[PDB]
Write a protein that binds this DNA or RNA. Structure first.
Ligand SMILES: [Mg+2]
Ligand SMILES: [Mg+2]
Ligand SMILES: [Mg+2]
Ligand SMILES: [Mg+2]
Ligand SMILES: [Mg+2]
Ligand SMILES: [Mg+2]
Ligand SMILES: [Mg+2]
Ligand SMILES: [Mg+2]
Ligand SMILES: [Mg+2]
Ligand SMILES: [Mg+2]
Ligand SMILES: [Mg+2]
Ligand SMILES: [Mg+2]
Ligand SMILES: [Mg+2]
Ligand SMILES: [Mg+2]
Ligand SMILES: [Mg+2]
Ligand SMILES: [Mg+2]
Ligand SMILES: [Mg+2]
Ligand SMILES: [Mg+2]
Ligand SMILES: [Mg+2]
Ligand SMILES: [Mg+2]
Ligand SMILES: [Mg+2]
Lengths: 53, 53, 187, 53, 147, 125, 52
RNA sequence: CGCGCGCGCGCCCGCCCCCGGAGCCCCGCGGACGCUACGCCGCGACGAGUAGGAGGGCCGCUGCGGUGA
RNA sequence: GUAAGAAGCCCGGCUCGCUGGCGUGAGCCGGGCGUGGAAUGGAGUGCCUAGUGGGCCACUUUUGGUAAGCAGAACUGG
RNA sequence: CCGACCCGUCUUGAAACACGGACCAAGGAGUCUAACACGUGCGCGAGUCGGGGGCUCGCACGAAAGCCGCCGUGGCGCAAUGAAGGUGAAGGCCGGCGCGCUCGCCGGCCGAGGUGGGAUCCCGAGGCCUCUCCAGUCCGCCGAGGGCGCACCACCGGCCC
RNA sequence: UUCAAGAGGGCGUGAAACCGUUAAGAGGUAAACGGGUGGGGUCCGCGCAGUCCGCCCGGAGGAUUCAACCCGGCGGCGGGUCCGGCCGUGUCGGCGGCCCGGCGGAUCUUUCCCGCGCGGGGGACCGUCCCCCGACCGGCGACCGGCCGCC
């Protein structure tokens, strides 16, 4: 990364677009978790209309 | 720059000797199958031998 | 029956990047979560631009960045881009910057780091500021291309400063009936 | 006079060569490609330079 | 790739995508660019104006090497030289005023598009423009001609 | 990394099976044998696997050693245990829970084990 | 028969261009013949420079 | 605004462990039997079709490269 | 066919080879004042682009013709 | 029991007293190159391309693969305009020498101009729940109002031939 | 004779149209067709009961090891008062390899020379790859010997 080839006359390696791929390790950090809303796991379904009259 | 650990040599009956080599920065380059598939399928044509009628 | 129309009941936006670049897709996994689980719109915008195509992600030049961040109030604040940073050799005095992007050219990389600057990625961004606080979205000239000169009203018309499609540029290839009063007319 | 052959830009071909070497480590990928490998002592496998003779 | 085409999708479909009232017949308008004055007058007055006629003088045996003048502006001038130069100038205060040949780096005429930072540079070139000559003396430099 | 290994290995792999609208995977140490991120032995820095004894009595347990990776010869630990099927499950349950070794695989292990022990008897008289 | 706003083009195919097509399939052998000739000359003129 | 407002336990004063598990429908310690995220789940509205335009095809035919110990 | 308000109203000051009893007009600056009839629903903008370019009927109006399952038109719907 | 006229095709209109068709198996009909326009995908980036040739493999693969003071001779691009000769893209603010004359000469500062709309970002009175009073530091969010204003659009203005 | 002539001299397999025979069924609005049921035959599976299976608790019967708890060895997980040491990065401190190591320079010395305005090695100078100790973030998923608890 620091120097270059010396046998190819100009070739430095490809650069990374995304350093840390440890995705689970990221999303479980405290920094992000503090910056979140609450989830919502409760589930709502087709209620059946009954007749009041 | 990322980590570059120590690789160990194995003599010609196994028998890990005391030689050690830190690996190169090639084995930390990014891995992209789409570019491999493209370069393969496109270079595997250049060995063809024509046909016709 | 129901008298309505179905010609305009599908919308023609993106839903995902059309490519298989896998590093892209992990970024997309991330920002969906943040857009889904946060009360912000910075997250929304970025998610929308990672789907975009490449003519919808033109390159930003080191020149514009400096002009847009030397403006008052934008001191100490991060610059954020969803494309590439090039170099502009028409600029000598490169100050301290804190840029974030996907790609960065090589000559541009060196100068930025030699002024004491810093270069980030979207991963290390979301660890420093999940919600976009202290940032500046920027964008390149989406109509910089030479394609947009041929568009609009047609040539062969009045008040149309539109470029035509011609093989070669010379003396014999236009510049006659249609463009001189002395030969036909002139729109 | 069909068009049998293809040209491909040099920088791409060099990239891919770098990529294949990387995944030559990472045991999981070797396993998946079907190589019975579960007894070698180290995966970037290296030996003395005597075996050239 | 034949398998990604739309001839692999018009099997069963009787006409292969070209109608029933009108058909894919051979050459039904002409053959080529025929009809700029007759029955294609409108495409060529509209989208290609300047096509029919004649204009200008004639130069019979024209050699494009006589007429050759590569151009450059002022902004893209300090890049012909390295960075040792521009920094070691404005330093040691002798009246350094370096020298810049354009004919070395493949350029003949100089043009005054942009601006440039304050150092008293010297320039050597075959041709100049009026504004370019001004800007240089304005910064405290000079201009020099060569053959 | 894990996702990186995964985004290559979704669709293209020698241990992959795709017929009859079903999709299975045969890599060693895959509980439930399905093509998944949660269930795959070759991807994680921590994995557990369960097999039958070769002699033909008991269960073989397999755990990864976490310290030296990239040298697969000595990355796996093995034990074979042969008891009365209530001690055997309880022993497993104690490994995982009390060491926190990938604890989202608990009951999957147990079901695989019981299946084996049920088979590893005179299923016929 | 033209259509909406393209180029005007003039291709040179109104002759019989098709008896007279030329393949560059002998490109490598042409290279290989030369080396063996280029080597052998320099062996004929033994110490003298090979270039000329 | 009376399904808590200061309830309980030792001796007002203090304790005020408490889910490595309270006690029944919110547990801010971690997880779905669901998590092939190119996945799983939920709601609500719609479905005519020639010429023609697009998409999905684990529908198919012949051969090349790898792979199914 | 127009109109039914923020692209509006008001206050004060600047520039002008334009026009000139003195003045008008237009443009620039800086301040003060938000619902402006009904009932409905997500709007806008840009590229590439196929097949078509023989028509037919009915109420009503309607031209030639003795009339027509005749010839030629306007409106809407098929 | 009820329903139900033979397929293809031309046509305003076909069950037709409009053409084709006894029956079966096999073949059979939207291609390849050259050039252009746009859309998508990849790589490098004011630069980018070795396609011609040469250095290394005898060529089992492989007529492949790698490499080059060729490393850019050159092509496309970075600058337009005119029949041509030929010319050739930024300003202001302040102070000194002539009369702000819709005008010429000595010294500093900024600098690709402005108006309107404008995703996001910034500051922020008073706080939303705090078993009581007051003190009250970390954190969301509000929200009065107020600013820096990306691309892009409409207009004004300026520079080159 | 041959495994095979259900391979017999134009003899690998051996389709369809079209024919001969046998078995069943039917028959005055040419035949054929779609939806809905019925009847009959040919075959599959009953079983010649199909009473389906699995957890815990209770009961009566017999039976042989272990575990409960202790001790010994072996292996592994985790830890941080960062116990001691490595290693790795990121700039810094030491210019410390810069000549004790090289690459480049449209910077000078043309302070020199080499053959005489010059082509090259020297001498500075600038950058760029590397040596000795100190630090911390990112000690991070870069490895040991420790001590401790648990399995
Ligand atoms: Mg419809
Ligand atoms: Mg539509
Ligand atoms: Mg159709
Ligand atoms: Mg078509
Ligand atoms: Mg047809
Ligand atoms: Mg027609
Ligand atoms: Mg076109
Ligand atoms: Mg439909
Ligand atoms: Mg059309
Ligand atoms: Mg029709
Ligand atoms: Mg007719
Ligand atoms: Mg018909
Ligand atoms: Mg008839
Ligand atoms: Mg006919
Ligand atoms: Mg006939
Ligand atoms: Mg056939
Ligand atoms: Mg393109
Ligand atoms: Mg036989
Ligand atoms: Mg036979
Ligand atoms: Mg036969
Ligand atoms: Mg028969």
């Amino acid at each position: 990364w620091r120097k270059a080839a010396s046998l190819k006359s100009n070739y430095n390696l490809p650069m990374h677009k995304m350093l840390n791929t440890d995705l689970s390790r990221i999303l479980k950090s405290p920094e992000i978790q503090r910056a979140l809303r609450a989830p919502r796991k409760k589930i709502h379904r087709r209620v059946l209309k009954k007749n009041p009259l | 720059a990322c980590a570059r650990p120590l690789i160990s040599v194995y003599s010609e009956k196994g028998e890990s000797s005391g030689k050690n080599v830190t690996l190169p920065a090639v084995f930390k380059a990014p891995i992209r199958p789409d570019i491999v598939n493209f370069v393969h399928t496109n270079l595997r044509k250049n060995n063809r031998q024509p046909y016709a009628v | 029956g129901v008298d309505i129309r179905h010609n305009k009941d599908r919308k023609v936006r993106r839903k995902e990047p059309k490519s298989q670049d896998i590093y892209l897709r992990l970024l997309v996994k991330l920002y969906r979560f943040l857009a889904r689980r946060t009360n912000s719109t910075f997250n929304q915008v970025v998610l929308k631009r990672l789907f975009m195509s490449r003519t919808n992600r033109p390159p930003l030049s080191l020149s514009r960045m400096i002009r847009k961040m030397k403006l008052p109030g934008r001191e100490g604040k991060t610059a954020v881009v969803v494309g590439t940073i090039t170099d502009d050799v028409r600029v000598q005095e490169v100050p301290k910057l804190k840029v974030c992007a996907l790609r960065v050219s090589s000559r541009a990389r060196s100068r930025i780091l030699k002024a004491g600057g810093k270069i980030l990625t979207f991963d290390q961004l979301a660890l420093d500021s999940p919600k976009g606080c202290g940032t500046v979205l920027l964008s390149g000239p989406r109509k910089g291309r030479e394609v947009y000169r041929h568009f609009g009203k047609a040539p062969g018309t009045p008040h149309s400063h539109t470029k035509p499609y011609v093989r070669s540029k010379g003396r014999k290839f236009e510049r006659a009936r249609g463009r001189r009063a002395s030969r036909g007319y002139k729109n | 006079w069909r068009r049998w052959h293809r040209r491909v830009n040099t920088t791409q071909k060099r990239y891919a060569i770098c990529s294949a070497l990387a995944a030559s480590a990472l045991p999981a990928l070797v396993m998946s490609k079907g190589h019975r490998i579960e007894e070698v002592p180290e995966l970037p496998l290296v030996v003395e330079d005597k075996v050239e003779g | 790739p034949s398998r990604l085409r739309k001839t692999r999708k018009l099997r069963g479909h009787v006409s292969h995508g070209h109608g029933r009232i009108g058909k894919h017949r051979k050459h039904p308008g002409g053959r080529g660019n025929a009809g700029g004055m007759h029955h294609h007058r409108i495409n060529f007055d509209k989208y290609h104006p300047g096509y029919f006629g004649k204009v200008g003088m004639r130069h019979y045996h024209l050699k494009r090497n006589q007429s050759f003048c590569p151009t450059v502006n002022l902004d893209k001038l300090w890049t012909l030289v390295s960075e040792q130069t521009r920094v070691n100038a404005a330093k040691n205060k002798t009246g350094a005023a370096p020298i810049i040949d354009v004919v070395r780096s493949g350029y003949y005429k100089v043009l005054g598009k942009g601006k440039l930072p304050k150092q008293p540079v010297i320039v050597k070139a075959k041709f100049f423009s009026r504004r370019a000559e001004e800007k240089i003396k304005g910064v405290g430099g000079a201009c020099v001609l060569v053959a | 990394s894990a996702h990186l290994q995964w985004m290559v290995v979704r669709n293209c792999s020698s241990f992959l099976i795709k017929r009859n609208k079903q999709t299975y995977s045969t890599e060693p140490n895959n509980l439930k044998a399905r093509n998944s991120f949660r269930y795959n032995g070759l991807i994680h820095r921590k994995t557990v696997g369960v097999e039958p004894a070769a002699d033909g009595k008991g269960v073989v347990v397999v755990m990864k050693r976490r310290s030296g990776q990239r040298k697969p010869a000595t990355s796996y630990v093995r034990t074979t245990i042969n008891k009365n099927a209530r001690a055997t499950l309880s022993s497993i349950r104690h490994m995982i829970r009390k060491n926190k070794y990938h604890p989202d695989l608990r009951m999957a292990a147990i079901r695989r084990a019981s299946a084996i022990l049920r088979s590893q008897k005179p299923v016929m008289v | 028969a033209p259509s909406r706003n393209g180029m005007i083009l003039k291709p040179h195919f109104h002759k019989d261009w098709q008896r007279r097509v030329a393949t560059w399939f002998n490109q490598p052998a042409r290279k290989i013949r030369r080396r063996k000739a280029r080597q052998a000359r320099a062996r004929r003129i033994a110490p003298r420079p090979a270039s000329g």
